[PDB]
Write a protein that binds this ligand. Structure first.
Ligand SMILES: O[C@@H]1[C@@H](O)[C@H](O[C@@H]2CO[C@@H](O[C@@H]3CO[C@@H](O[C@@H]4CO[C@@H](O[C@@H]5CO[C@@H](O)[C@H](O)[C@H]5O)[C@H](O)[C@H]4O)[C@H](O)[C@H]3O)[C@H](O)[C@H]2O)OC[C@H]1O
Ligand SMILES: O[C@@H]1[C@@H](O)[C@H](O[C@@H]2CO[C@@H](O[C@@H]3CO[C@@H](O[C@@H]4CO[C@@H](O)[C@H](O)[C@H]4O)[C@H](O)[C@H]3O)[C@H](O)[C@H]2O)OC[C@H]1O
Ligand SMILES: O[C@@H]1[C@@H](O)[C@H](O[C@@H]2CO[C@@H](O)[C@H](O)[C@H]2O)OC[C@H]1O
Length: 427
């Protein structure tokens, strides 16, 4: 299949997952999208230390099992997140140190992995162990103070607890190869593989924003780790602004690495995001697919003027007008600014530089025109591989009225039909 992210990824033996929040599983809109699009699930918080072991020796898997069962019942594998790390520790663990903390760490791993033995595809055994100070060294935490060998111990413990689970080291800001942090993790994993430490994968959270931007060398990082003999996975992907090109780029990086198991985005809709203000996911709050969604889908499926297939004519702004409200038409193709459209990372189709293909409504027959660019979803479009152009807000296709092919045929929104008057080719 190839109409959903999970199915499209499966074509190359990969998966496309999301982070599921137990509190949202009772949401029809949420579950409809989640069950349909993803085939891998990570509990957003339900399998962390404080959630699974509120009291030392007292385990609670109610919430974790709810997400797990929903995942398997709906055809998704599960990534366990996370067994040992400095964040979100229950109060009792936060105050522990030395040998007692080391024992608690081990006990926690055995308890949680034991409960889910043989049912977890990947476990983020250790997370966030390195610092952001630029030294490339370990971050100072109670776990690190128990001995630099805590990570190695965590992994050896995990292997014995559940030999069937792939064991991953997970962290953020380790995507750009030139960063010290990235190098620190690389050296650690290289050391582990050389000494036989049981580690099967490295998880790259991939939280990209202007503070820690995506860089094409992320592919190099993935390939360098893959060369060590470990699988790699994009575990908590979200991109500030949800740039279509960046989302497609990350997707293609995984597809370019045979050892990249799959990609998980950190959430379903922008409104479900831990950083909703960065509108970093693939679905809008109203549940509509964003421009980035189609960019990712096209990439998973194999991956100027806009000319209509059925008419052989180009999307044209009448008399090269720059007046807001001017409805677009079909017209003989020629070199003119009123026929030069630029698709942006935000999903707009710009003309004249600051004018945007705009839909003045959401129903059939809605006039497609130009209007000042401002970022509305009625100015954002999805470029399908089949040649159709779908409005984000409306979910409707650009359509040449009445199947018209002559000069002057107007453009409207209309239920997608795969008709030639709804298919376009970029020149
Ligand atoms: O419901 C919530 C859960 O969703 C949430 O999940 C955790 C989210 O992801 C992981 O934790 C976060 C990872 O990203 C960190 O922020 C980085 C910090 O560094 C920034 O870049 C810096 C820019 O300036 C430079 O000088 C510096 O060197 C750079 O590091 C980067 O842009 C940010 O994205 C967050 O602090 C982490 O919390 C974790 O795996 C998930 O479990 O957990 C909370 C829950 O409520
Ligand atoms: O995917 C399937 C759908 O395609 C199918 O319904 C199709 C919907 O599009 C139909 O063609 C439309 C008909 O309307 C034309 O525009 C109107 C022309 O007259 C004007 O007065 C009016 O204002 C315009 O809106 C549009 O250009 C043309 O593409 C097609 O015939 C239907 O079959 O339904 C089943 C779906 O699975
Ligand atoms: O007379 C006007 C037409 O000129 C206009 O369409 C233009 C035709 O010439 C082409 O070179 C232009 O690109 C195209 O916009 O449509 C409206 C009509 O009244």
């Amino acid at each position: 299949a190839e109409s959903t992210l999970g199915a499209a990824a499966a074509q190359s033996g990969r998966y496309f997952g999301t982070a599921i929040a137990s509190g949202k599983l009772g949401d029809s809109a949420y579950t409809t999208i989640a069950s349909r699009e993803f085939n891998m699930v990570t509990a957003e918080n339900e399998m962390k230390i404080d959630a699974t072991e509120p009291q030392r020796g007292q385990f609670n898997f109610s919430a974790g099992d709810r997400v797990y069962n929903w995942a398997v019942q709906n055809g998704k594998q599960v990534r366990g997140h996370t067994l040992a790390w400095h964040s979100q520790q229950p109060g009792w663990m936060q105050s522990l140190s030395g040998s007692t903390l080391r024992q608690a760490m081990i006990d926690h791993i055995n308890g949680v992995m034991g409960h889910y033995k043989g049912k977890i595809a990947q476990w983020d055994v250790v997370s966030h162990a390195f610092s952001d100070d630029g030294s490339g060294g370990r971050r100072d935490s109670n776990l690190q103070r128990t001995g630099n060998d805590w990570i190695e111990v965590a992994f050896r413990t995990a292997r014995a607890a559940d030999p069937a689970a792939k064991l991953c080291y997970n962290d953020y800001n380790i995507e750009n190869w030139t960063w010290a942090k990235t190098q620190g993790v690389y050296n650690m994993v290289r050391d582990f593989k050389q000494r036989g430490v049981p580690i099967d994968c490295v998880g790259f959270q991939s939280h990209f924003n202007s503070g820690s931007p995506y860089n094409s060398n992320f592919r190099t990082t993935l390939q360098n780790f893959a060369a060590l003999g470990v699988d790699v996975a994009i575990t908590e992907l979200d991109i500030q602004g949800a740039s279509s090109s960046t989302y497609a780029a990350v997707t293609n990086d995984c597809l370019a690495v045979s050892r990249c198991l799959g990609i998980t985005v950190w959430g379903v809709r922008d409104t479900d995001s831990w950083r909703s203000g960065d509108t970093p996911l693939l679905f809008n709050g109203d549940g509509s697919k964003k421009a980035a969604y189609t960019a990712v889908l096209n990439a998973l499926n194999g991956g100027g003027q806009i000319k209509g297939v059925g008419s052989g004519r180009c999307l044209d702004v009448p008399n090269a007008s720059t007046t807001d409200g001017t409805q677009v038409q079909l017209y003989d193709c020629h070199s003119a600014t009123n026929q030069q459209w630029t698709y942006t990372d935000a999903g707009e189709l710009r003309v004249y530089g600051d004018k945007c293909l705009d839909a003045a409504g959401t129903g059939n027959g809605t006039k497609v025109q130009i209007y000042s660019c401002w970022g509305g979803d009625n100015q954002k479009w999805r470029l399908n591989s089949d040649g159709s152009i779908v409005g984000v807000q409306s979910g409707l296709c650009l359509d040449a009225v009445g199947g018209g092919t002559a000069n002057g045929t107007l453009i409207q929104l209309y239920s997608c039909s795969n008709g030639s008057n709804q298919r376009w080719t970029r020149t």
